[PDB]
């Protein structure tokens, strides 16, 4: 089992500003990792393929970079249709583990 941990849980203070969201792993894993965005009461939706790529239709300003058990991503502009959660997903080392939960909100 891999302890998927994140300290900055609730970034509801940022409105159109810098986001310093990150997650960490217990054992050393490489870039084999994705994050999700789950709308409340709806299905999740993908943004990052394997810590270095980007989804087909998204704003281009989403950029993630992380290697060696610290994994980092930023949302510098908070458009109002991104009001959902963001979860950290380790895979390819069984069992695949999820983060506890990150909350964003616009004021």
């Amino acid at each position: 089992d891999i302890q998927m941990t994140q300290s900055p849980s609730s970034l509801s203070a940022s409105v159109g500003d810098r986001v310093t969201i990150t997650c960490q792993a217990s054992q050393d894993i490489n870039i084999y990792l994705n994050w999700y965005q789950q709308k409340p009461g709806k299905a999740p939706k993908l943004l990052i393929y394997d810590a270095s790529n980007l989804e087909t239709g998204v704003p281009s300003r989403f950029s993630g970079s992380g290697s060696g058990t610290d994994f980092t991503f930023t949302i510098n502009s908070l458009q109002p249709e991104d009001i959902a959660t963001y979860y950290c997903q380790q895979y390819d080392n069984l069992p695949r583990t999820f983060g506890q939960g990150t909350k964003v909100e616009i004021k």
């Binding site: 393929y49 394997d50 790529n53």
Partner: peptide, 20 residues
């Protein structure tokens, strides 16, 4: 309970989810 296929083999634009 959310149903899917797992979202990427190594690197593809395949991403679809399913309602649960």
């Amino acid at each position: 309970y959310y149903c899917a296929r797992e979202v990427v083999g190594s690197n593809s634009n395949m991403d679809v989810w399913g309602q649960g």
